[PDB]
Design a protein around this ligand. Structure first.
Ligand SMILES: *[B]([O])([O])[C][N]C(=O)/C(=N\OC([C])([C])C([O])=O)C1=[C]SC([N])=N1
Length: 263
């Protein structure tokens, strides 16, 4: 079947010229709303949630891990690293790296998380350990953002990512202390006000992680605490046919607004 919400998302997609993927989970009733829910999309920096969560999981067996310094060297800087560049020739802890990766989208910070996990495949291994058979991380920053149409590297589906994000933030994939830390980090994101946040009632509280890449790839994954009902999990992924296409965070806001209006 095609629901009213799905036909509105298709109309949005048509006007946009790109390809839109949406997955909602309403945790009150566990119901889902999917648009291209099983198609793959390049994750870009939304993948940083999985990496930070994998380090949080390691910290469950190592109480001091998050206070562990990681050398930052000049050669570690990549394309976008506003936090890490202030610590070149110095150190950041894994908590600091996690916070920078999630809340500022620092790419050097993400590379340190990936290295702590043994490379991209360590992030994939964690995904598998928490029941996500779909996610794959294949490269480091910045190349994981190439977002080439048809390329499976560094992709997931909306359905899989919504289910993962629920398990991480609201479920029991992480220990309680760690779940709370992830939620705190997501709620303090600095980059999200134009994306899912922008299509929802302002009284709701959102924690999210955005992504951006080539092909005008514009992504957001969010946990949402609406006024008056149980939390929601929402993934909005968007990618365009031209390598140097413009960001379209408005499309994500519009998708979120359609979802909200369909609840
Ligand atoms: B993540 O997806 O947030 C990391 N994003 C990036 O590396 C890219 N841009 O990030 C900045 C510079 C913050 C931006 O303008 O969104 C990126 C990689 S390839 C591309 N076209 N943009």
């Amino acid at each position: 079947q095609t629901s009213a919400v799905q036909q509105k998302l298709a109309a949005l997609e048509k006007s946009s010229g790109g390809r839109l993927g949406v997955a909602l989970i309403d945790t009150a009733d566990n119901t889902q709303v999917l648009y291209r829910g099983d198609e793959r999309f390049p994750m870009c920096s939304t993948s940083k949630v999985m990496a930070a969560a994998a380090v949080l999981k390691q910290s469950e067996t190592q109480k001091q891990l998050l206070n562990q310094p990681v050398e930052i060297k000049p050669a570690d800087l990549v394309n976008y690293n506003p936090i890490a560049e202030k610590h070149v020739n110095g150190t950041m802890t894994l908590a600091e790296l996690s916070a920078a990766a999630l809340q500022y989208s620092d790419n050097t910070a993400m590379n340190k998380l990936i290295a702590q996990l043994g490379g991209p495949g360590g992030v994939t291994a964690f995904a598998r350990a928490i029941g996500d058979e779909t996610f794959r991380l294949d490269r480091t920053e910045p190349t994981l953002n190439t977002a080439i149409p048809g390329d499976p590297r560094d992709t997931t589906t909306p359905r899989a990512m919504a289910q993962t994000l629920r398990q991480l933030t609201l479920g029991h994939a992480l220990g309680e202390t760690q779940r709370a830390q992830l939620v705190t980090w997501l709620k303090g994101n600095t980059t999200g006000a134009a994306s899912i946040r922008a299509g929802l009632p302002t009284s709701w509280t959102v924690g999210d992680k955005t992504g951006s890449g080539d092909y005008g790839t514009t992504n957001d994954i969010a946990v949402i605490w609406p006024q008056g009902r149980a939390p929601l999990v929402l993934v909005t992924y968007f990618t365009q046919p031209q390598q140097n296409a413009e960001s379209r965070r408005d499309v994500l806001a519009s998708a979120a607004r359609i979802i909200a209006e369909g609840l």
